[PDB]
Ligand binder design. Structure first.
Ligand code: SF4
Ligand code: SF4
Ligand code: SF4
Ligand code: SF4
Ligand code: FCO
Ligand code: FCO
Ligand code: F3S
Ligand code: F3S
Ligand SMILES: [Mg+2]
Ligand SMILES: [Mg+2]
Ligand SMILES: [Mg+2]
Ligand SMILES: [Mg+2]
Ligand SMILES: [Mg+2]
Ligand code: NI
Ligand code: NI
Lengths: 269, 551, 269, 551
């Protein structure tokens, strides 16, 4: 019955989808994550304590595990109007995040919102939402983008920190290479169809119903880094957007997802 | 009085603050506050109508699928598109399987620790615990050996000194009433629930392309390519795989979640007599099965002043009485325009000026239906079905009541459903009835494909001039959802979401009337004002989602 | 408690791997197959009865379900020396098969051995092993090749018969198009690497360790029909030979598997 | 007096005929016959040594993996290749996980219906059945509710009139001795076993690329690319997935299969006094862990005349004493050359001439070790480990014996293990100890990758001239396996497989001595010569595989 590595999870402008990804995980399952792999010292979605009790839990953990915990943040951080678009216990979330970051052993931005602003920072950006990295300029933030990522993109990052004592290898956006090191289109099983000019033109057409390439439906695989075509989702086999019949939207990738229209064509290298 | 704040309210989705005035240990007045805003309505504006669903689905990842489905329905409403029946079956299976996961997680991972004391579970006799369930459940994982294994996992966690999500919980609070044995039962079921919800989301994933955040919709139908004989598409092998997961849900739902709902009610009978949030209730019909966006499997309607006998049926998502009644006010919200607004003419102009008890105190708007406050969600949904004389709903409620009667010697009347426990019961009934929805719609899909219909998508045209309006209704896990889209010169010129937690959590309205969360708390006993578990019990019964409420 | 469709399974020169594929299936699991989907009226690997009793079961079922049962054969059928290379209850297996075929509603050759002779007919073909179609020239035999196939290539074929009352659509080798309709190389996720000239040259080399194309290791994907890259194996996600690091050997395809060396290069169309 | 034939023997792999003379109600003499041949040794001849393993793996799909591993080890022997340690860890994990699946399916799907009466299970009291296992097992799926569900599935099958694989079983036979309750326990476990074996094969699949028939080996190591940071290769996420399945096997193995083994022994104690096949036993060491094809986790050895105290250890797969002892004869087999042949000089020339009691009656060859008949497989394996004083094996056997003691008040001595039930026990012990092999080798692999070793493959060279002889040993589920390869002028000039079921099932030998199956049956009581269940009980204990025996 050894001690487990501590984790503090703070949600900013988050839809909760990134936490929810954990409920689909199988290696580890969320119950084994929290009972065996880590000690989840703060997570407002699951914690028994509320209010003043859960704020006491955070302070006690920040002290007990100073220099030792992994800080995880989902959601963007809104800077407009002095932080008031996300207030918890009467204070701007950016202040909670900066405080928790001071004592962190490692810091992870789970999801596109915390990794690069994501949907919440799109369009006119009503709240001046920014990334975790932007609010922590002095820290190396590990970015695990996707909306939400496959949960094991996160869990295997945490396991590498635990098991081998350092972060996994990262690209120049501080994304783990095992998950984000290649364009989806450079490892997509519909590339033969692309190459042959075999394209779906509309959902339900004959090419679509033969599993042909979705480029002409707006697939963003050519300009999105990720592992969606290989790792896929939910561990049942065969399940990712393109395999189900819908183009990649680029949700991993800044300037693609939530910026380009679904049916807008990608640039191809 | 004494003034307390609960901030953050945990074991919800999103960011909630609840304040209460307490007089002599009884809540006299409450305030609900959504404390985070993104402006998702403004973010989606000025785009192609086809793009909205991918963006607004991100209003929430707990109730994933829901905003995606409401958004396409809204565009289809505006454009006058009839969705292919195969697309409806697929949408329906996704929503029902999603909602199964959602409700299970709400009862166990979000709510159970309001009612269940893990310290007490360590004192339980696992054999006595198993024996308590004889003749009450046929579940196969209620043995003393299962319960001992669970007990040992808790023991090990407590012994580690790293309690994590369980640290500083309300163990030994005077409002914790379960015996040790029932606490252990509930913890065992909490862990088992995680497998059932995982199977529910395998259904969702196989049609949606993943979950959270499905990616198989379109304005005009779905992106799934139906071809029984095609490689790499939705063929018989894939459908068989979907069915294998559908079939795994029922036993836990019926023999565990349904049973625990009755068991909790049996030990907490005072919670049948508090937590009434409203006297008016609204639900929309759901699960369309024809070629013209109707013929719903579940009925909708409007109940006024708790009178089921005179309710108004709603059988169409184009019902003009429903559409015309809905308004929202920002009098007590942090937006500029305060008069009630119909959502097609809605604005969302931020005007944060800090907290005031009598002024603005929330990012949630205040919805009304022809000027009245209304509760939405599983209590509304159940009561409307009972008012409709839906036998399936009556029968399912009766099964919960029969277990409760066996444990207590007492029955439950409909009057007692207007309560914190009634709301929880409505949600369980919903989860149970959804398993028949899944069987029904899977069978319908297989049958329809067998007749030679492989159609899934009708390509929209969007006029490049003119201004036109649509609304997409959906009966979400937390209640009636509506997305309101105005298209002008081919792009979105207004977008307004009126979300179920908006109805329930919204602050005092244009007439200073009190909405369901705030109303529900009046009268709540608070044994310990530093640790107001009783307040959180009632709030959690509404299944708050504040990303949803505020967007 | 309705009646279930009867199935007669006869093994010829089989290794039992085709039956064993069923023990990996999930939709249905083998227990749900035999309790819910079908009535498995004869299968020597699982039957309680042996000897005289099991031959009684076979004769009873052939009579009771004449015109109604699905006949399944795994293994090749040896014709050399008058059938004596496979003798069951004192008689050549070819005779048992021909007798059962007389009353079959549908006939399936599961695995490469029954589909086209497979490994048992390779090289000098010591036993004069042939396919099921060869011993049943007047019957339509549905071929489900692979060594062994994904069990759902078989199970969804049987399900199509039961549910819709006819076989699935078949190609010109009588293979179901949903599983065998396309070359593996025309739906392979490493096609981008093939296209870019990014190739593993030896196991363990840098290209191999980045998941590059296995053409130069001998991948037979370019000349093998199958669903190995999409449906894959075992329903865990991401598991087929190429994904694991080894070329396709062409085990589905006559003249490729068991004929060409592992490292012999495929012809590319 | 009379002569019977059992043909086909079912609930084995492949095609077996057993004949017996019965005198005074007891088997006096038996014949074992493999009735199908393919010529796999001839099919692989004249090919590149590197191709053999993919071809000869198809000797058997029940013991998939084994012939693939033996084949690469044989080529590596001939070529003098030292396999990378990471490749050893991967090969080991595969073999251990495969064998877990294999043994579970043998005990349940292949063997239990010799000892278990499904008709009698319908008469069981599910609560009494569950109560019987208190203090015998901690398994979490032994509740009355589980057992009732199982009983109802049996009920429904029988009611349908379509018994399928259960039709015309030996229900009510006088040699069926379990009480109704224990029948029902066994059938519940039979179904539960299928989940555990599926999990075991998920381990195999994630390293092998599929199962049946793995595709990750090479002469020189494995094809898995180790790269913790690589997309699409064997990275930390994939390793974590493997581990999640390894961890799911132990509870069923320890709390169900191990316990059931003791339960069957307790109800059938006379089966500890019959079914002795040999007085000599052979196993090879297995699971190498060094960089030089050695340092095995499990020991091997040779026992002569049942004397454990004077056994000869075997610690190397290059042991010349082991190599030089092995020969095969075809005097009573359907091959032309009859004198004992060392496998490097073996021929396989078919010479079928029909059945003769005193002549040729099988496609199985007759192996000897220095001229003696030998039993291989789990009984050999266990006895060698006991002779080696392996504490893990002692301890695991003792656990089984302690359950037997609690149920019967009697103990078990090593003398009683030379029996049908002893053989079964050896298999169970093996399966149990393999779970520690899996944990050990997973950890070893993680640790080694962490030290910066990602090597998996050493490319071979094969001289174009010269003659090179290699042998690959492997301790397979059914016993010692050996593949014998001769390379001449760059290609395979001879290939001979000597497979464990060859040892056990082979017919009378050059000296007309009787092999294990045939020996084991002498003395078998047969109550009903038309339904010789007792014969099949002893034959099943050896876990026959006739595609293996004959190839
Ligand atoms: S990344 Fe996507 S799923 Fe995660 S918080 Fe942002 S919107 Fe939600
Ligand atoms: S465009 Fe999309 S579907 Fe087509 S090959 Fe590229 S990533 Fe795959
Ligand atoms: S096809 Fe392959 S797995 Fe099936 S019987 Fe033939 S050799 Fe065995
Ligand atoms: S040669 Fe093989 S690995 Fe390469 S793209 Fe073709 S099928 Fe895929
Ligand atoms: N259910 C749900 Fe989410 C909320 N409130 C929506 O719609
Ligand atoms: N185990 C196994 Fe198969 C046999 N006999 C081999 O080797
Ligand atoms: S939309 Fe996102 S989930 Fe993958 S397929 Fe494209 S990066
Ligand atoms: S060897 Fe066979 S299993 Fe598929 S990957 Fe190639 S056809
Ligand atoms: Mg690393
Ligand atoms: Mg709104
Ligand atoms: Mg068809
Ligand atoms: Mg080298
Ligand atoms: Mg041989
Ligand atoms: Ni929500
Ligand atoms: Ni075998």
């Amino acid at each position: 019955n050894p001690q487990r590595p501590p984790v503090i999870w703070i949600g900013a402008q988050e839809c909760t989808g990134c936490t929810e990804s954990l409920l689909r995980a199988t290696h580890p399952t969320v119950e084994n994550l929290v009972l065996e792999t880590i000690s989840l010292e703060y997570h407002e979605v699951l914690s028994a304590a509320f209010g003043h009790q859960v704020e006491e839990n955070k302070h006690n953990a920040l002290e007990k595990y100073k220099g030792q915990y992994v800080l995880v943040v989902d959601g963007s951080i809104p800077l407009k109007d002095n932080g008031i678009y996300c207030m918890v216990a009467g204070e701007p979330i950016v202040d909670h995040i900066r405080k928790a970051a001071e004592g962190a052993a490692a810091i992870i931005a789970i999801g596109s919102c915390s990794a690069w602003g994501g949907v919440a920072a799109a369009g006119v950006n009503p709240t001046g939402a920014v990334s975790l990295q932007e609010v922590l300029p002095g820290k190396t933030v590990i970015n695990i983008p996707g909306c939400p990522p496959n949960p094991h993109n996160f869990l295997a990052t945490v396991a590498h920190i635990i098991t081998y004592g350092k972060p996994p290898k990262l690209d120049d956006k501080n994304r783990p290479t095992f998950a984000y090191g290649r364009l989806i289109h450079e490892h997509c099983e519909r590339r033969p169809h692309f190459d042959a000019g075999r394209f779906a033109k509309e959902f339900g057409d004959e090419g679509h119903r033969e599993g042909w390439c979705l480029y002409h439906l707006g697939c963003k695989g050519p300009e999105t880094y990720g592992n969606c075509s290989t790792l896929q989702f939910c561990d049942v086999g065969g399940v990712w957007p393109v395999a189900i019949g819908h183009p990649c939207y680029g949700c991993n990738e800044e300037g693609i997802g939530f910026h380009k229209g679904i049916h807008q064509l990608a640039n191809v290298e | 009085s004494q003034r307390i704040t609960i901030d953050p309210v945990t074991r919800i989705e999103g960011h909630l603050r609840i304040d209460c005035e307490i007089e002599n240990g009884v809540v006299s007045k409450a305030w609900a506050s959504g404390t985070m805003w993104r402006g998702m309505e403004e973010i989606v504006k000025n785009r192609d109508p086809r793009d909205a669903w991918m963006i607004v689905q991100r209003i929430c990842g707990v109730c994933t699928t829901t905003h995606a489905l409401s958004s396409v329905r809204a565009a289809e409403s505006a454009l006058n598109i009839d969705v292919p029946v195969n697309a409806q079956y697929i949408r329906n299976i996704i929503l029902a399987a999603h909602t199964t996961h959602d409700h299970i997680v709400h009862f166990y991972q979000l709510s159970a620790l309001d009612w269940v004391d893990i310290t007490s579970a360590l004192q339980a006799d696992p054999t006595k615990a198993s024996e308590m369930l004889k003749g009450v459940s046929t579940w196969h994982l209620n043995s003393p050996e299962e319960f001992t294994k669970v007990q040992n996992k808790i023991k090990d966690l407590v012994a580690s000194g790293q309690l994590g999500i369980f640290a500083n919980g309300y163990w030994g609070h005077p409002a914790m009433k379960l015996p040790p044995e029932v606490n252990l039962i509930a913890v065992a079921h909490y862990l088992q629930a995680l497998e059932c919800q995982r199977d529910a989301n395998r259904v969702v994933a196989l049609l949606g392309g993943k979950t959270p955040h499905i990616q198989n919709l379109a304005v005009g139908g779905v992106a799934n390519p139906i071809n029984l004989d095609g490689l790499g598409v939705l063929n018989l092998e894939r459908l068989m795989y979907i069915k294998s997961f559908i079939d795994k849900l029922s036993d836990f739902v019926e023999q565990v979640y349904k049973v625990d709902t009755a068991v909790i009610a049996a030990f907490y009978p005072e919670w049948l007599t508090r937590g009434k949030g409203a006297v008016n209730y609204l639900s929309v019909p759901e699960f369309p099965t024809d070629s013209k966006n109707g013929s719903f499997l579940f009925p909708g309607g409007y109940i006024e002043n708790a009178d089921l006998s005179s309710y108004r049926p709603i059988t169409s998502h184009s019902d003009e009485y429903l559409i015309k009644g809905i308004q929202e006010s920002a009098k007590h919200s942090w937006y500029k325009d305060e008069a009630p607004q119909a959502p097609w003419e809605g604005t969302t102009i931020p005007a944060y000026d800090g907290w005031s008890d009598d002024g603005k105190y929330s990012w949630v708007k205040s919805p009304t239906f022809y000027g009245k406050t209304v509760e939405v969600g599983p209590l509304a949904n159940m009561l409307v079905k009972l008012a409709a004389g839906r036998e399936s709903t009556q029968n399912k409620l009766n099964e919960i009541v029969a277990i409760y009667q066996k444990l207590t010697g007492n029955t439950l009347e409909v009057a007692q459903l207007h309560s914190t426990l009634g709301r929880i019961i409505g949600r369980t009934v919903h989860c149970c009835e959804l398993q028949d929805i899944l069987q029904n719609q899977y069978s319908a899909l297989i049958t329809n494909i067998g007749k030679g219909d492989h159609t899934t998508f009708v390509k929209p045209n969007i006029p490049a001039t003119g201004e036109f309006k649509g609304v997409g209704f959906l009966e979400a896990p937390r209640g009636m959802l509506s997305h309101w889209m105005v298209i002008k010169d081919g792009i979105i010129s207004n977008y307004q979401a009126v979300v179920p937690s908006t109805w329930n959590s919204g602050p005092r309205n244009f007439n200073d009337d009190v909405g369901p969360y705030e109303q529900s708390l009046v009268g709540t006993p608070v044994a310990d004002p530093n640790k107001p578990l009783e307040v959180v019990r009632t709030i959690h019964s509404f299944d708050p989602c504040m990303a949803c409420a505020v967007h």
